[PDB]
Design a protein around this ligand. Sequence first.
Ligand code: HEM
Ligand code: HEM
Lengths: 145, 145
Amino acid sequence: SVYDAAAQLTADVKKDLRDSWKVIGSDKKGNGVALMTTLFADNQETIGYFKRLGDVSQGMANDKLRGHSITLMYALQNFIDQLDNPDDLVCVVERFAVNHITRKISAAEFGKINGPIKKVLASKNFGDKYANAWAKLVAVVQAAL
Amino acid sequence: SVYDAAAQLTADVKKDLRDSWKVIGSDKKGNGVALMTTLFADNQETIGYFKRLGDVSQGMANDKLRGHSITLMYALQNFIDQLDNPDDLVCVVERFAVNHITRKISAAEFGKINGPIKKVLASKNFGDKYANAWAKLVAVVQAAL
Ligand code: HEM
Ligand code: HEM
């Protein structure tokens, strides 16, 4: 369950999540667009899911893609600020999951975000240990999908 | 249009937004549920829109409502963080608009939020000048509906 998944994020994982977010979160426009573009480059099959965003090849130039990327970063910001209270983390994760469930995104597909996140972290000198801490947070959301 | 609305956000207006958000933004969960509950009390005509949240009268105890309130606060967070770049502000307000547009929320409906905001601010010692500042931020979203 979502609680089980969340309830496991240990004090060390919370620390790595926060430390890394201090950096990749300080520049939401840049990193967020980086996440999306990388996701499209490595998993072309997901481009169709974003038809409403227009031409995603435009990158930073596409306002729809830019506004979406910035907003996505605030969803993560929200998850990070609720790390100390499982109760709050869970209920916010639940609301969030609804959007991707109606979007027909399965747990396995949503998991594809791991690759990109890993690459954005690396570009900032945050190795495997950190990528793993993020896969745990991503796992909490997967438990609600 | 939206851009003309964004221009209304002058140095003073943006300054008042930041100064107040610094206080009401430190307790997203607290102030978030206050806005929501103040709305349902001053405008029972809108409760129908939040059928999915269940018994909103419950307040903080309602998990679905609490998660929604918190998330709502991050949306505003996103707007305040884009006050320097109207371009960024506009693209995010647009993505945001698409959410309520699909919920059949008209600009007239959205404007009803000004009342609650004004009351939450006042409970934190923020007067009309401040409520007038947020009124303009809200108008940007309205021009996008
Ligand atoms: C780190 C994980 C992710 C986060 C935080 C996230 C965040 C978001 C947010 C906040 C929205 C809606 C924003 C708005 O409407 O203003 C959204 C929508 C959506 N997401 Fe994600 N997402 C994530 C991963 C994914 C993945 C992996 C996929 C695809 C394989 C995906 C597919 C979608 C789709 C189809 C929409 C609808 C976009 C539209 O048509 O406007 N998301 N996401
Ligand atoms: C301060 C202004 C407002 C902000 C920043 C705001 C923010 C939000 C956010 C972030 C969501 C949830 C996004 C998601 O999870 O998909 C949302 C959903 C919604 N909003 Fe607003 N909103 C505002 C005012 C209003 C007003 C005035 C109404 C009603 C007259 C309204 C009606 C709705 C409805 C019906 C939903 C969907 C609820 C659900 O099914 O979970 N909003 N809003």
